[PDB]
Amino acid sequence: NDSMYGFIGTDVVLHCSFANPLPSVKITQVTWQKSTNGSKQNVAIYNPSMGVSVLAPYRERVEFLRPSFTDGTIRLSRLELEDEGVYICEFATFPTGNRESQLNLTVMAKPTNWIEGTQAVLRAKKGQDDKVLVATCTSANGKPPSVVSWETRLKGEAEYQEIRNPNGTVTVISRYRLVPSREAHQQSLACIVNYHMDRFKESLTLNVQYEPEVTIEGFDGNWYLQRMDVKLTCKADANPPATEYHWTTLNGSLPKGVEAQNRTLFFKGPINYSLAGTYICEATNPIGTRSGQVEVNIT
Amino acid sequence: NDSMYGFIGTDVVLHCSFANPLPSVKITQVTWQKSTNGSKQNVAIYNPSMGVSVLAPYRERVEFLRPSFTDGTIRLSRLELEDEGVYICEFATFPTGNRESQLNLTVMAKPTNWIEGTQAVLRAKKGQDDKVLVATCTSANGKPPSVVSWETRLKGEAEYQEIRNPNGTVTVISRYRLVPSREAHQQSLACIVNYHMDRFKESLTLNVQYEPEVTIEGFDGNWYLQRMDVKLTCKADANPPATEYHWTTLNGSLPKGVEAQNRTLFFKGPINYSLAGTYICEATNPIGTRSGQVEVNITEFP
Ligand SMILES: *[C@@H]1O[C@H](CO)[C@@H](O[C@@H]2O[C@H](CO)[C@@H](O)[C@H](O)[C@H]2NC(C)=O)[C@H](O)[C@H]1NC(C)=O
Ligand SMILES: *[C@@H]1O[C@H](CO)[C@@H](O[C@@H]2O[C@H](CO)[C@@H](O)[C@H](O)[C@H]2NC(C)=O)[C@H](O)[C@H]1NC(C)=O
Numbered sequence A: 001n002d003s004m005y006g007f008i009g010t011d012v013v014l015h016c017s018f019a020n021p022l023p024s025v026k027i028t029q030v031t032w033q034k035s036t037n038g039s040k041q042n043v044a045i046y047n048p049s050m051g052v053s054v055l056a057p058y059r060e061r062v063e064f065l066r067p068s069f070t071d072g073t074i075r076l077s078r079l080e081l082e083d084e085g086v087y088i089c090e091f092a093t094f095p096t097g098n099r100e101s102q103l104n105l106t107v108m109a110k111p112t113n114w115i116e117g118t119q120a121v122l123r124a125k126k127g128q129d130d131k132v133l134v135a136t137c138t139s140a141n142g143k144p145p146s147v148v149s150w151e152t153r154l155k156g157e158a159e160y161q162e163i164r165n166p167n168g169t170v171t172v173i174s175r176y177r178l179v180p181s182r183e184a185h186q187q188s189l190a191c192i193v194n195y196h197m198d199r200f201k202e203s204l205t206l207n208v209q210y211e212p213e214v215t216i217e218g219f220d221g222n223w224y225l226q227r228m229d230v231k232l233t234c235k236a237d238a239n240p241p242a243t244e245y246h247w248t249t250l251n252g253s254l255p256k257g258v259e260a261q262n263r264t265l266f267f268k269g270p271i272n273y274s275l276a277g278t279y280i281c282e283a284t285n286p287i288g289t290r291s292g293q294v295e296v297n298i299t
Numbered sequence B: 001n002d003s004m005y006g007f008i009g010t011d012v013v014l015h016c017s018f019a020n021p022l023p024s025v026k027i028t029q030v031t032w033q034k035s036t037n038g039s040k041q042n043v044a045i046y047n048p049s050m051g052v053s054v055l056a057p058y059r060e061r062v063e064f065l066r067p068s069f070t071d072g073t074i075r076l077s078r079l080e081l082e083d084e085g086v087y088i089c090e091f092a093t094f095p096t097g098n099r100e101s102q103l104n105l106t107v108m109a110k111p112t113n114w115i116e117g118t119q120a121v122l123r124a125k126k127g128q129d130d131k132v133l134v135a136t137c138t139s140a141n142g143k144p145p146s147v148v149s150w151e152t153r154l155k156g157e158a159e160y161q162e163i164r165n166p167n168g169t170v171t172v173i174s175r176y177r178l179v180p181s182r183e184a185h186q187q188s189l190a191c192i193v194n195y196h197m198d199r200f201k202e203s204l205t206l207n208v209q210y211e212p213e214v215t216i217e218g219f220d221g222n223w224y225l226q227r228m229d230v231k232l233t234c235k236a237d238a239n240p241p242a243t244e245y246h247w248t249t250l251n252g253s254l255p256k257g258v259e260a261q262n263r264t265l266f267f268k269g270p271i272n273y274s275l276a277g278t279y280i281c282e283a284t285n286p287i288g289t290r291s292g293q294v295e296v297n298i299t300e301f302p
Helices: none
Strands: A002-009 A010-016 A026-036 A040-048 A051-054 A062-064 A074-076 A085-094 A097-108 A114-118 A132-142 A146-151 A156-162 A170-178 A188-195 A200-203 A208-217 A230-239 A244-249 A259-260 A264-267 A277-285 A288-296 B003-007 B011-012 B025-033 B040-046 B051-054 B062-064 B074-076 B083-094 B098-109 B112-119 B130-144 B147-152 B157-164 B169-178 B189-195 B198-202 B210-217 B230-239 B244-249 B258-261 B262-265 B277-286 B288-296
Touching: A002 A010, A010 A097, A010 A230, A026 A114, A026 B025, A026 B083, A026 B098, A040 A062, A040 B098, A051 A062, A097 B025, A114 A188, A114 A200, A132 A146, A132 A188, A132 A200, A146 A156, A146 A170, A170 A188, A170 A208, A208 A277, A230 A244, A230 A277, A230 A288, A288 B258, B003 B011, B011 B098, B040 B062, B051 B147, B112 B189, B130 B147, B130 B189, B147 B169, B169 B189, B210 B277, B230 B244, B230 B277, B230 B288
Parallel strands: A002 A097, A208 A288, B003 B098, B210 B288
Antiparallel strands: A010 A074, A026 A040, A026 A085, A040 A051, A062 A074, A085 A097, A114 A132, A132 A170, A146 A188, A156 A170, A188 A200, A208 A230, A230 A264, A244 A277, A259 A264, A277 A288, B011 B074, B025 B040, B025 B083, B040 B051, B062 B074, B083 B098, B112 B130, B130 B169, B147 B189, B157 B169, B189 B198, B210 B230, B230 B262, B244 B277, B258 B262, B277 B288
16 A cells, blocks of 8 residues: 655665554564565564564665664665565564554666667668668666657657566667658757656767759849859759769850859850850769759840 | 365364474464455464463464464364455564465355245146246255255256355255146155255155046947946046046937946946947046046947
8 A cells, every 4th residue: 555666776764663552462573574476575573582683685785773662664775676576564462463564665777878870871862762760769777667759850750669678677769760861961860768757868960961952153133244254153962062063054065265163163254145045063972963053144 | 275174163273383493493473364365364373472362253262272382273163154264374483584374264054955835736727838836945055055956757947046145155046837737746846955965855746636537448349239237437537536427428318227326337237239329427526527438339249
């Protein structure tokens, strides 16, 4: 009817006392036993005439706090998982017989938490429908088991696993999988584990490689007849970054003289009614090759 | 792991002893408790320094046989149903703690058995399809429950009922029903009750009243022209027995001189070619009236 909880390593005080000592009634012995289901083992004994007795596996771990005809309260020190059980405290008395009480000792263990990414190089790819492992969250050897979950704006799938260890602790593992995408890059993925009203949180930032997404800037609403010295710039979003930039027009040739320094496209001084046209930058990176465009107006 | 059985009123010995008394290990106190599946009430205590104590109950019903540091054996006397339960015998010791053993005490009760027939007078009737109670077999307040059955060549139905009393005993009742018939009369129907390998048996003989069933004997394959002094005799099977026997022919009149002394139909001396005919006996009893017949032949050669 009464429960005690304590963490591995800590000390708990197990109370036991005799309700209504009466002059006639003589307490012979006080005995703590522990029940592991169906089975009693002896723990500690206090006998007024004979003293105290602690049994292995309690050798240096139990003492009576105030041994007495009516108080058998003990302290159990340096809790270990093996201490879980039901503790019976029993007063042997004359002439009235035995009188006992019970209490449940539950031993708890705080888990060990961490997150870790794949060794694999996350790589987005057209036609790949395949979900890939990207992070693993572990809450190890906790008791009771912790609860694992994810906090991310990513839209991947999580699988969860519990391993009940023989000692009674439980390791909780979650594997986070997704289909790698441009948008997933540099996104944060946070594993979470609430244990005993603590909330632990540990983050990753995903590194996803992707084919270049090309844009061309430097264009202005108005471009004169004979405006000066105007540039175009090819901003290509890629990971890893793009290593080559090649220019062309929609009509084949780059109108001499429009000079290309890579990923910059300079027009010298005079502009005219020629230089009308689609312009294209072709970016390349380890993943990819792709292009962008500009319609250029001059009046 | 260890079970004791005793009957109500008798005594059992609940053995308890401490295996390996050691100089090291001091027995402080010896205690019997009677666990009632959840609770725990003290029974008797033996303390070497202080003596013996029987809590009450069972003030005059328990004693340690040979109270001792290492023998806690008690006798529980004049057993009662309330004594059922699990008995824990526990040795309190220093420095080694408690040492206990358990045994199950099952208290048994011998049932009371009997049979009793209906007080109604059983009466057969044509067209009555209805099964009627004819005997009740009771095995009362037994524990464990006995097993009731019937031993009869009668063809009736038995219903069985079990009543669990609050004290834990069990009454078994069996009701034996049949449709009363001529054939059921004087048939024996005893009830059987098996308990603790005893076989109890108690019998009834049915008394079924019925309308007469008439037979006519004394007719012989051959009856001469002019054979002597031949009788017809009307045996009427009835219960209670028939009190009246009335004769007639199928053609009305009795050929004089054929004399009727009741339930005998005497033909004096000479027989002839007359005296041919169907003859009928009409029996009557409190239940009934019914008749029988004979077709009578008379010719020359036998
Ligand atoms: C419960 O048992 C587990 C399983 O053995 C213990 O966890 C192991 O601890 C040691 C180091 O402390 C490692 O060598 C193992 O690899 C650990 N983990 C696993 C999954 O095997 C754990 O210590 C026990 N829990 C306690 C004592 O709280
Ligand atoms: C168990 O309960 C029954 C039911 O009352 C007891 O049987 C009765 O005994 C008394 C005499 O002591 C009779 O007058 C009753 O008529 C009995 N039978 C019934 C069916 O009522 C029986 O004694 C109890 N068994 C015990 C105490 O062992």
